[PDB]
Design a binder for this molecule. Structure first.
Ligand SMILES: [Fe+3]
Length: 176
DNA sequence: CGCGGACGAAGCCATACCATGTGGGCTGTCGCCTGGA
């Protein structure tokens, strides 16, 4: 699916301009890498890399992709509808009023989409990383507790259009 | 001297703006008189 550039990532004090979400995800991941090489100490990187059974190369790669996903939860409807943006393109997912923050949205959606990329479904690694970046605003949220065998739809993610776009963004930052 | 009644001693407290649609049940009338049935 062709990725769209209408979705926002930053709106405060832009004098009427909108910033694409994908560019924020990517430049964020880049910040993760450059800080992973220039800022962090080699010994601490030995600590983290050792604790995660991986090496600097793939550990840095992983956390870079994770930073690139920090704000993926912004692809809801209450998030972009905050200002006048045309949403009639993709129907469904009407306003329920859960007041979820984008960080909560990502923290609750990641444990069920990324398994197509290889993380073990229901495992621990995907959980810790999911809540880990999902709490990117200082407050961590609990692990997803669902009672329906279709968790994606019970959390309010039922439109195949929206899900197809966020999967597209996921894959985009994944090969990037 | 023996004692009633009343109080007081604490353990407690609590950084990345908007809405509401409803109802139904009670009252009595004449023209009067003759004729025919
Ligand atoms: Fe964020």
């Amino acid at each position: 699916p062709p990725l769209d550039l209408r979705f926002w990532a930053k709106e405060r004090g832009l004098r009427g301009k909108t910033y694409p979400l994908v560019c924020h995800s990517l430049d964020a991941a880049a910040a993760a890498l450059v800080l992973w090489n220039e800022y962090l100490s080699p010994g601490l990187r030995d600590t983290i890399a050792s604790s995660m059974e991986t090496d600097e190369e793939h550990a840095g790669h992983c956390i870079a992709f994770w930073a690139g996903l920090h704000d993926i939860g912004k692809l809801t409807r209450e998030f972009q509808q905050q200002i006048a943006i045309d949403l009639s393109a993709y129907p469904g997912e009407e306003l329920s009023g859960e007041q979820r923050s984008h960080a909560a949205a990502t923290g609750k959606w990641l444990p069920f989409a990324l398994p197509s990329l290889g993380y073990p479904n229901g495992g621990l690694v995907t959980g810790l990383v999911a809540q880990m970046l999902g709490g990117h605003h200082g407050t961590f949220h609990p692990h997803p507790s669902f009672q329906s065998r279709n968790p994606l739809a019970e959390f309010g993610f039922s439109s195949p259009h929206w899900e197809k776009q966020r999967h597209a963004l996921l894959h985009a930052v994944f090969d990037a």
